[model samples]
Target: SEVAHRFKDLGEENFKALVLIAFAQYLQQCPFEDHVKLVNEVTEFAKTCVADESAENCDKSLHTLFGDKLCTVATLRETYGEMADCCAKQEPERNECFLQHKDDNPNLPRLVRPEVDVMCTAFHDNEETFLKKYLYEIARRHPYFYAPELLFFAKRYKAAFTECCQAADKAACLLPKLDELRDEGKASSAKQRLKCASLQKFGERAFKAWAVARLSQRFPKAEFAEVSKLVTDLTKVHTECCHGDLLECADDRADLAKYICENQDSISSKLKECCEKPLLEKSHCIAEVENDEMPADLPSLAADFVESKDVCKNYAEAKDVFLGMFLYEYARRHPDYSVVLLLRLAKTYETTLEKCCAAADPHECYAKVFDEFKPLVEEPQNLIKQNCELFEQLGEYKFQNALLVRYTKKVPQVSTPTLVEVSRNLGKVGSKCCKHPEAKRMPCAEDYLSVVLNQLCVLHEKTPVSDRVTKCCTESLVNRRPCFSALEVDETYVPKEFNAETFTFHADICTLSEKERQIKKQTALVELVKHKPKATKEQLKAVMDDFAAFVEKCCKADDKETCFAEEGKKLVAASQAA
Candidate 1:
């Protein structure tokens, strides 16, 4: 008489949820009149499964009941396929298998792309069916979207269809509203990408901590462990998804989305409106929700301060874990700060601890570390914003070109090739960071740009290349970008003077080895460009061609040594004059 009594090990809550999900899927295909058919079939399945109390019999009824109703949709196919597997397994094993299915099927499509004409026709033929299909497609595809939110979207769809299905220009009216809905999806995707940047920056554990804190704060009434498990699963999914594993991300996110959707009562009620908005907008919205309504008994998170006692010991033993924990705690509390800023703060703290730990009283020395670390400064954030904005405005080609030209003028003494490489690296900073807006964009740009500058700094470590470049390189990392930005072309700077030696080819110039001779010619071209720093790229290119021609002409001469000596002098005079 008991339903799924044999599968009692599967946990009552989970068994019910899985069964409901499977059955609910059937309702999507069965029409209002045929809904009775679905109900009858499911009732039949329950009766048979309960009576037979065997894995093979239960599995067969599940196939007949839910599998028959499961549409040809790729996502649903995978969902039921897994469900079939779980149903086929024996009791203890089967229950565990079913428990795994509690999460929504992975790799489910995010949105359905129904044709406007088809949708319009469907709406005209059967309004209720059209709306039900719409809700079903979205609810299944975006199982992460909360019920109330999906219902809200369904209502909007109904309104749009009701208004537009009668219009003279039905498609024209519906297209815009449809686009609005799709745009919300895009906005949600943007938020997802943005979180990916954080996941990348913080790694899994720290990111999980941040997610847990966020979920806990937003859903203060929820069990801490439950919230933690959800965050952990989601964060792990994000790490893979964000880092280039799309399929895994899709599946994990879908599963977690369903998990969150089912457990909405545990999360914030405020999420209703947020969820009703486009997917990412809802995601971003819920994240931005400032629900600090912690019970009076719960202690506030330690963001601005870290414990001093044994701080050095813990830091020494596990520096990464300690710093990661700090980042997690700091980010959860100070959601306002950029991940890059948080990263910098952690580094600052690490540095302080490093020095203070060596001191007689490590605790006292590092006690005010957070206070001394002025993370609110706008320098890095402002720099990243400017760089990314400029990059986007200029586009990649123009952006890199602009940097190449700018850097070339600032440090003309540096080789053209080297300057171009620097420009390209800096351009990549924009390309990498600009995808993520605001805070998320900061770390990507800053970290990349830092590597570029730090490498540049290494170039001038022993000797000054250009006064402006050397000066900028001498500035600390924080000050370097600004310093470089302010540098103008050094009018007084002089290029290396061209002389007989600059163009003088060896008697070995007529060497038998063709590759070595070409190498010598390239070396000569670089020397000419170095000496003629004021020359345009085009002009230098011309010089290289002319020198190549001269090399060919002289190497063929009967008196090669005399030809090289006479022609080399003429080439230098011409290059210097130019």
Candidate 2:
């Protein structure tokens, strides 16, 4: 009678809810010594509730709680007790009577297991049949309540199976559970009722809730709805299957389970398919917005005719030369082209030229010429050719001039201008005379020379050397006296017939200005004396006396050097002075 009351009371919903709360509490307090005592007490109470209870009444109550679609309470309780007893034993025997027929109970959960040293092994071979019956009942009557929990349970079992069981065994145990859940969700005819907005929303929410619960277990930090969006989308097919609307509803649950397992791949592919129309429309909108925001023609054309001339020097090679020419032709032809095209053309020319120069012969000489003349040439082809021309012309002129001067007793004047002057003249000629009609008509050397000279004169007048005197004295004159002397001669004299009357010994005095003549005579005398092989006694005496007088005068003029030299003897004096 006491066992009957306990068993009868356990079938109530409130009792089941209390059992869930107790289970949660037990989980929370797991691994404590008191947990073993508490489990023993609960097991004793459960055994008392089952004893003397009619099998029919027990079966009826189980059908009410678990749904009549599944098995009886008597069978389920016996299986649960057997599993619990197996776990309780210190070392359960292999052929123990307690272990035999443990799985024969018809109402056990599909993945139900017997206790082992580390974990548990599934006790029953009827996992598919058991899971299908259980899940079908849940789907038929309690989907809103059980779907989320079942999803989580399935995932947990999957993790456990993977961790401990053999691969085939794990799959065999886990796949059926997944299939049962999927098939049941798809079997319901309630989705057809989702024509109503509230029903549709509720269906959506239910699917989302199921997905959220499952994903939350796997990815705990993720937001429920965000993490489960794809899963919800997938489960919506279940709703469609229930409504008998989806053509593919007849597809196997095993196939669907396989698909769900490959969520990353399937979601990405389906997202791409679903998003194409929206993405295309968004791209069009972006184009329109860009068009509206931009200033007409200006931004578009800014880069259109950009040539390598604006950037750096061109290298001499057939491919680079051709590329430069091609770009120039394109720029001339397409003045109103977009800036992107211009940038592309400019970049192509730069890349081509750089590659060409990397392999150019006499690289040092080429680089020097490139640096000097790169800024002058406006056309790319001409820029490349000019660099080559500079190296060739300068090298040839130096060779010829050196040969003539050394062998023929005659100095060869190069007549070649400085790089700065040449570049300036080139710019002017390219800008001005290159476009002139008469200049174009002329093919003579004189005409070309005239154009070059005119450009040179213009450039020189515009950019006169202001520090010429100082530079000439310090840098040019000190290194080579002939250069300054030649410059002075060229500046002062006019070409005329020589006369013996004008070639008086005093002619040198008259040839120079009054102040300059004195300085020049002193300089020449110093040079001659300093370079003389060995001075005679008279010459040495004269030079030593002059040098002694000069030093005395300089010391007197500067008091800083005088004090130390005057205070100390020879060696000490030198040290103090220094």
Candidate 3:
């Protein structure tokens, strides 16, 4: 209960000392006298460690442990904290209130809804989550968000989500209004955002999970495969029409209407025809046209996701599509991020991500990598450079081996000792392929990984069950295979019939700070060197040289020292252990 706070000063040395001393006392097997002395010393020592240590010392100790991750501790904390803060909400009324308010007051931390999601995630204008929900639910059937005055409908959707506090029964009043307005394409001024309704519905429900609910209202079976295409395409319409900016339900209504009225002579054939049709047809076909891009405060970023299909299609490496979509979304979430810069990222990595698929199971490795890399990848310029470096690493057998080490050591669900062997099997796989005489000419490890990534892991979308499925985990109790291990469980597997579409997607990146990450890397590096009982001199030296560079990279800050002497000792201990 008090561990998070209590462990503040529980540094690596103190813990190692405490545990070892305690063990030594017990091992003596002296009956009553030594037993009491053991209990008193260990208990007092542990209690002192837990006794509200100073944040400054705790931070210093933390730096020593996680120096390599000095670059991203806050982002790690804030990202997960933000998601937890969002889900921590439980009330629907208060939830909508903050979505609108937080955008208005950038400084304000939105209040949590009592009944909303507590561990995961929110926003367009920052209500983006709710907007996506509305888009997927109502606009799926109407792809031309611009074609049918779709911008108008979207604005009203934002209003519906932001306006519930005005109602006596918020969910009762707001949910139906959201649906009604979507069906009718309208919003009433009376129920607009009352002071502060800003929580997002998306954090409360994973996008797909929410999709199922929306689907259940329309179809009896609610098969996701049926509506996925439509849900996926809503932004494309906005992408084509408004560029990066989604149309406001009433963003520029007067101008939009004037344009419609002025262009009526040329465009009214369908409008006129639609006027004669029912509400569905009329609202569905109002303003669709392949027109010039609309001006925006800033551009949305390149909407080249669909265009990338030829290369990223599952026939293409799934990582290509996944990374492309991730960058798109990452840029999408932060308006400050230029979509074009993101494209540069995709252009650089998509080709190389195509090259480095180490896990035979596309499995959760893609997700794992994305989560781990996000903290480092946020800066677009640096991302391109860093990404290029990783790709360059793809050519080496060692780099490929490193990622495998990273996966097992860092994955949350893993009990490190149990998965250690599974991590070693990759070494076997790599050697079996790379050591062969035939492999001398090619990047065999890279190629072997590429095959697993593309052919096996990145199964073409057209393929069965494997499609949309990247890497599977049998979660076998015994076999700890290279591509198989558990550090994070799929939500669907744990809670049956639960809506978890965005559960893992919103997951925190098993985040670690500079020192923390280094510790794990050091731990893994040690094992990787020792994984082979007969590790070669070449392999041993390669690790030491690479790790020396690692120490320089990680432990290089004066204002803030990256790691402690003790951690550097880890490399020493590891070498001796090997």
Candidate 4:
């Protein structure tokens, strides 16, 4: 009956405060239990309060009660629902109309109006504080109600805070008071000193908790193995602190900051690790619980197991291929750590293969490395070719110089090449190997050269002449005479009446010249043939006959009579000798 009378007589401010106090008291009295009916009653009251036609009076009452605590659960829920409902109707004008009414309501209590403005301002000014206070209050008072619901709000709030902090100007007014408080020394009054001390301690705990929670939520599902180590250490300190054993005499807030920085990497790493396997597994369980299949994007069974082994193991193995390429490129640009890290990585790769990849031979492992590196090398070359100006501006010297030095000194066995320079020099090397005088004798080398030449030919055909000159070199041997001689002639015997213009030769003489010329001409003629085009059999035969006749003329006598007579005598002599 006293509670009922108080509820009826309560002014807006008293009423809201009474509700909050009652809610807290109720929780303190009752052990955690289902509050479905209680919550339903509260929700009903909220709906009625929000729906009241005396919109101005209701808003004023809310403003008086909450003051600078406009971020309270009641306000947020009401605002969110109203805004959402307005939006759901696809009525932009209606939404604005509602917002306008709320903004212009004159019956809004004077104290509450300013306080509400301050609260909103505080939210903008110190989001960290606003969120920490908001969530902490909710958790402390209504842990059961806040646990599930606040998790979502906490995440959304932290994200917004992080984004704000990232873009926040250091010199801005947002952190002015915070900066002042950090420098505040011992005050004269005991009350002031105690208050300041308490505030400092409160702020420190709140901030640290907020930071940890923010970071954790930001990287939700992060394994944060390293961060977990730090967390464990901090928890130890926290345990000691709770037990009245101050770990450090330093200001608790400052100490927390220092602790965070000291173990930032661990925290980050832990967060990352948490996300990889543990979170994914939980996610899998959740999916199954919901009667959903595991995400298709999840790794295959083999990959999943490898990933599940450890966060680092999974990331290093899967991403390391790309990471290796990245590190290689980074090392190329920033050579200071290049040798150390790359050599370490290379060694790691070798050792890993030796230890873990025992099933695979060293060559197989090396093949994998090449497969990874090949794309890295080729991609940059392609990019450079596509955007020459951009590539040049980025400077080709560092890459070229690094590669040359690395190949010559560091990894002498491995050929390192700058993408741009490699593409150019490879084109030339390929041409020389393919078109050299000795290439014909070595078909393997010839075939490789042919591949190079064909690539160039295709490129040239597609590119404009100006671009072609830059993209490829024209060094085909199709039109060039062979510089070296392959002919072997025996001049041991000569006829006394031998003549250059007219000579009567035996069949032996004719055969000797024809054989010598045929071998010599065929060797040189191979260079003249271009890449094959689709041709009819008759066309091919004609080409062959023309080539043969060309060889014949080189050995032909000027006089046909002399040629026939010499051939007839040689045939007779050869028959007699046999």
Give the number of the best model, judged by TM-score. 1
Q: Which residue runs of candidate 1 sit more than 4 Å off their true CA positions?
A: 1-118, 126-159, 166-173, 190-206, 212-307, 310-329, 343-361, 364-380, 384-578
- Model 1 Cα shift for residue 471 (angstroms): 30
Residue 368 lDDT, candidate 3, scale 0-100: 35
TM-score of each: 0.39, 0.16, 0.18, 0.17
Per-residue lDDT of candidate 4, residues 1-578 (tens digit): 22222234433322332334223322222212222234334434444555563433343332222222222232243434433333333233432333222210122221111233344456678664455443434433331221222333444444544444444452253244333322221011111212122223343332233223223333222233433343344444333322212112112322444444444343333322223432213222221121111123422322332223342344446643433333333232321111222333333444444454444343333334434434433432343233333333423432222222221221111111122222332233333333333312132222222233333333333333322222232321211101101111212212122222322222333455443433332322221111122121234334435444433543365654554455435433432232
Model 1: per-residue Cα lDDT over 1-578, one tens digit each: 23344234333322332333333432233233343345345455565666676744465433333444432231344435546665455544543443334322334444444677787788889775566556545534332333323444566777888888788988899989987876564334334433543454335655664465455545665565566677778677766544433223434554565566567677656656655665434544554565544444544334323554777777788776666556555554543454445555666777887899899988778777757555444776676777677888877755765566556667777754456556666776776678875735554565456556644554444345666676665544344555776677656767666556546886677764564564465445545544554635667656666777877888788773888878778777776676
Better of 1 and 2 by lDDT: 1
TM-score head-to-head 1 vs 4, winner: 1
lDDT of 3 by residue, 104-138 (tens): 11222322233212111132244544443333333
lDDT of 4 at 457: 32
Model 2, residue 447: C-alpha shift (Å) = 88
Q: Give the lDDT of residue 327 in candidate 2.
A: 38
For each of the candidates, give the backbone clash count.
3, 1, 58, 24
Least accurate 10 contiguous residues by lDDT in model 1: 9-18
| Candidate 2 C-alpha lDDT tens digits along 1-578 | 33234334333322222223222221221222333343344434445547745543343332122211111221244434443442333322311322232221133233433333223244244443333333333332322222323333334444544454554555556556555645434322122222111123334543343333333323323232334453445465455333321112212222333343345332222222222333222222211121111112322212322223332332343443344333333333332322223224444445544654554443332233323223322232342234334434434322222222221111111111322232332222233333333312121212222333323222233344323323332341111112222342122222233232311122233344443443332332222222231312235334434433443443355445543234312322232232
* TM-score ranking from best candidate downward: 1, 3, 4, 2
